[PDB]
Design an enzyme around this catalytic site. Structure first.
Site: not given
Lengths: 129, 285, 232, 130, 55, 55, 232
Positions: B89-91
């Site tokens: 979900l960090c990108g």
């Protein structure tokens, strides 16, 4: 008395998505969430137990002012169910004093303010939560 | 599209938006605390940095610098410390970093150097355990605020390596933090050559009590450990900032999807009311 | 049933698919030329349902207790027939596939099964208190189960692991050997009074039930019956 | 009257001005005075002593280094402890570190964040019909 | 420790006085309530007697 | 001298605590009497009202 | 109102909840037996809305200008009743709750409220230019409302920090004392002409009054009032 109640409840509702993440939040945000949780637990009420106007005023004055902050959330309801009983037995005069000047424009007049403050402090000192 | 399943879609996307908003708030808070931790860690690294400058300004002897400060000519074996966020979900950061690990593992593998990898994080541990590059060293379960004690388990070994000759260099791939929105990946060299502009050191002289050689041999591992710790803290801050940005974008996308689904649900509601009144009027007539 | 109720005897009536009653009326109206109401349903929906659900009541002589079955078209509780049925319902029991496939013979879901009698004024303060104590460890439905899935309990929970143990024990304890199945599974049927049930669940929630392992609550009528088994 | 700084890889312990430093240098214990000559030493596991206006504070140091300029002293110690406090355990420093830290500072953070991710993943499966 | 003990003893004495006050007020309240209930019951009985006289 | 005056102040504070306790108990007794009288008077007036409405 | 309009006077007609007029028309049509149209609306919806709101015109002799409260069914601006109302509307004013919670009594939401006549060829180029810039900075402030709560005002770049600072001042300046509220608040009403409003807001945007804090713009009249107050 209920203006601060409504304001704090609205602030908690704006942060209602954040209750389960209260630890990893700002100190002011955590305080607002905790106050909102306490107020919501206060509004919880059993069936066939209506509270008179003086009892509601006393409880809401104790809540809006920082007096239930030390009480944990799951016991807030119990706190109310005890506090009023205290006012019903230990201090019957403060309830009548609140009910008599409930129509006063500046309701927290010094006499009733000191009476209610003293009643709340006396109840909190004796009880443990 | 039955005016009730669309309501379920709206509720689900609203739940997604709420969860994403909460995650964005907590990622912003943890990014702030990680930035505070980096700022608190700065003085130690800075102080030991001018200590490196002064000491390297002296003891220039290659034989004296044969300990860690030495530059292996063969460079036959190299090692990469990759610090990768532990949860996704960090990108694009997790990928941007594991890609530069490749650009490197290749440009190096192309130099005939046997590239190996010590990984900080489960995200990295996997990309390589899968690729086949079983991390020569893996530090997982890394908290927002770890202590230097943690990186030691891996840095000791990488260093004992540049000493066992098993390696001829150590680079760390970590996620820098340029702007609260930008988090470029970056590589740094972990070989303690130092020797900055003589101007930086000012040639401060000291009477090294245990000896110049002993002080250097005991201070270089601590310097590289401090560099690894600073890189890990910057990586944590960049991870939190990237997660905050990703959740902001996801919340905006969820709000747009909620608006579109609301339009569709209202169209379905009007169609349902029209159909109901039409069939009721037909039955009446 | 009302004949027997007039004698003073208690009657249990099962109207299987009461909803198919409503549907029938709808068709009876459509063929009768009655003007349609809401989604094709009969105009006399509430009155028709009342004329059937009001004869199911407890008088002084006797009581006709009813436990009906409701089939909702698709999954629409907004539909007029399920809404009209629910307007006359006192309790809902939600049988579930997951509980049934776990060898739990009574598939009644502890959650999604409500009853307006569950208030301290009727059942009693202790009955309400324990019924809120249970279904609270399951209020999260052991939401820990989601956390266990991606944390493995973080190896173990600080105190949650206890809650999981209590939840599993009470879920097993909800099962009961039935007399009608006594000749199928070869296990005697156990009839448990409400007082025995409330006492057993309260004492299990206090922690008396923290000494017995699971599968000892698997098919036993009372906590005392579980204890006899542990002692033996 | 010398600018002493006990720094650590985690945080800064002290930054005040001190009368005397009873540093445990590897070769032997060394005392430092406001005009000490430039020096750089390796410490060993011991109990460094800070003399501040006649008050002795025994900061235990399991290891670290020291740079002594004529005007300032910096201690790049690995770990700095104050057993003199003793109540440090009962004190939040350790007592909160047990509950106010790790227990909720980390464990609760991990639980809440993992639960949020789980709810997200489940509802994103549930929305897989749009 | 003497200042601390003075504060603690003052607080304890005030708290005990307030507890005794609450206890005696509660006893008076319950006595008044039971006597009021007795008076109301007697009045209701007299009213029923009046109704029987009318009958 | 500080210890001497602290002991003296502790004695004075405990004496003041006893005096305040006596005052609080006396006020509580007065309140209890007043509340009992008010409740009894209310009960009597209510009983008279029930008798009148019964007539 | 047409009698006063025929005398050459200018009339304001305030219709509260024109949607209730639409609903009354729909109920009358249903009672008369007419076939229903779309979502329970009369077949003569457009014609009935045209019989009304067409006598509200600016003629040669006089003019009738109408403000009509509109209740939006559910939240549909595409619903036939608000759609037919919008087909006859020249300006929309959107009072919003948050703008009124803060004591900005003229709680008109500038971003939501629009008007047809706000074009250069009618109100003038200067009026159009300042109004767009007022909305532009407010729209930028609305975009940064998230970011300010995200990281604090510090992350915002300069100029953007000015737009947030300026936007708060201008939205406070939207307040205006009212002559009908003079007795309640003890503040004389201020009638600000359109040209004076345009000049005041242009001179607020260009840079004048930037040194003045957010206060002294609250419940004021023209920029002249904001300065005179700052001097005193």
């Amino acid at each position: 008395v209920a203006g601060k109640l409504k304001g704090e409840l609205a602030q908690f509702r704006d942060l209602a998505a954040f209750a389960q993440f209260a630890s990893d939040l700002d100190a002011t945000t955590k305080a607002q969430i905790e106050r909102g949780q306490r107020l919501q637990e206060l509004l919880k009420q059993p069936q066939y137990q209506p509270l008179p106007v003086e009892d509601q005023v006393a409880v809401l004055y104790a809540a809006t002012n920082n007096y239930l902050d030390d009480v944990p959330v799951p016991l807030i309801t119990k706190w109310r169910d005890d506090f009023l009983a205290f006012l019903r037995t230990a201090h019957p005069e403060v309830r009548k004093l609140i009910y008599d000047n409930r129509l006063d424009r500046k309701f927290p007049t010094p006499e009733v303010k000191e009476a209610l403050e003293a009643a709340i402090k006396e109840f909190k000192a004796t009880s443990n939560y | 599209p039955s005016s009730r399943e669309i309501k379920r879609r709206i509720r689900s996307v609203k739940n997604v938006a709420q969860i994403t908003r909460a995650m964005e708030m907590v990622s912003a808070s943890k990014m702030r605390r990680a930035q505070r931790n980096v700022l608190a860690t700065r003085p130690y690294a800075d102080r030991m940095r001018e200590v490196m400058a002064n000491l390297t300004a002296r003891v220039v002897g290659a034989a004296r610098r044969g300990t860690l400060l030495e530059k292996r000519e063969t460079v036959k074996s190299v090692a990469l410390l990759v610090v990768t966020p532990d949860r996704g979900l960090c990108g694009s950061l997790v990928a941007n970093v594991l890609r530069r690990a490749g650009r490197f593992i290749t440009e190096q593998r192309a130099m005939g150097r046997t590239v190996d990898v010590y990984t900080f994080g489960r995200k990295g541990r996997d990309f390589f355990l899968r690729t086949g590059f079983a991390p020569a060293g893996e530090a997982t379960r890394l908290g927002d605020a770890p202590k230097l004690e943690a990186i030691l388990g891996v840095a000791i070994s990488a260093i004992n390596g540049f000493q066992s000759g098993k390696y001829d260099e150590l680079y760390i791939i970590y996620s820098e933090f340029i702007n609260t929105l930008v988090q470029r990946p970056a590589i740094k060299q972990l070989l303690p050559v130092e020797s900055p502009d003589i101007s930086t050191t000012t040639n401060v002289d000291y009477t090294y009590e245990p000896g110049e050689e002993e002080v250097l041999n005991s201070i270089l591992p601590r310097y590289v450990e401090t560099q690894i710790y600073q890189a890990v803290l910057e990586s944590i801050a960049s991870e939190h900032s990237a997660r905050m940005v990703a959740m902001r974008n996801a919340t905006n996308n969820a709000k747009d999807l909620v608006r579109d689904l609301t339009l569709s649900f209202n169209k379905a509601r009007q169609a349902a009311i029209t159909k109901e009144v039409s069939e009721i009027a037909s039955g009446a007539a | 049933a009302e004949y027997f109720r007039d004698e003073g005897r208690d009657i249990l009536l099962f109207i299987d698919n009461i909803f198919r009653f409503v549907q029938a009326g709808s068709e009876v109206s459509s063929l009768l030329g009655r003007m349609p109401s809401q989604v094709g349903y009969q105009p006399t929906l509430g009155t028709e349902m009342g004329e059937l659900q009001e004869r199911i009541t407890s008088t002084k002589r006797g009581s006709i207790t009813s436990m009906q079955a409701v089939y909702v078209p698709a999954d629409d509780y907004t539909d007029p027939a399920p809404a009209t049925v629910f307007s006359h319902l006192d309790a809902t029991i939600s049988l579930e596939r997951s509980i049934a496939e776990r060898a739990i013979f009574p598939a009644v879901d502890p959650l999604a099964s409500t009853s307006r009698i569950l208030d301290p004024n009727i059942v009693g303060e202790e009955h309400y208190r324990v019924a809120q104590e249970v279904k609270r460890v399951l209020q999260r439905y052991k939401d820990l189960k989601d956390i266990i899935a991606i944390l493995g309990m973080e190896e173990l929970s600080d105190e949650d692991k206890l809650t999981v143990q209590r939840a599993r024990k009470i879920e097993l304890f909800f099962s009961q050997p039935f007399t009608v199945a006594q000749q199928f599974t070869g296990r005697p049927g156990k009839y448990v009074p409400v007082k025995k049930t409330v006492e057993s669940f309260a004492r299990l929630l206090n922690g008396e039930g923290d000494h017995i392992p699971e599968s000892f609550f698997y098919m036993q009528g009372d906590f005392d019956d579980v204890l006899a088994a542990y002692e033996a | 009257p010398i600018h002493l700084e006990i720094v650590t890889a985690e945080r800064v312990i002290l930054s005040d001005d001190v009368d005397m430093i009873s540093a445990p240098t590897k070769d032997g214990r060394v005392g430092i005075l406001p005009r000490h000559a430039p020096l750089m030493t390796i410490l060993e596991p011991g109990e460094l002593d800070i003399i501040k206006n006649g008050e002795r504070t025994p900061f235990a140091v399991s290891g670290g280094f020291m740079e002594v300029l004529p005007h300032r002293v910096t201690i790049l110690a690995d770990t700095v402890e104050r057993a003199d406090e003793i109540d440090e355990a009962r004190a939040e420093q350790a007592r909160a570190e047990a509950e106010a830290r790790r227990r909720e500072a980390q464990s609760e953070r991990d639980m809440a964040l993992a639960e949020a991710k789980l709810r997200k993943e489940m509802v994103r499966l549930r929305v897989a019909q749009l | 420790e003497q200042l601390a003990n003075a504060r603690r003893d003052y607080e304890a004495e005030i708290a005990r006085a307030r507890q005794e006050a609450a206890k005696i007020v509660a006893q008076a309240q319950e006595r008044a309530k039971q006597q009021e209930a007795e008076i109301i019951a007697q009045a209701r009985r007299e009213a029923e007697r009046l109704k029987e006289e009318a009958r």
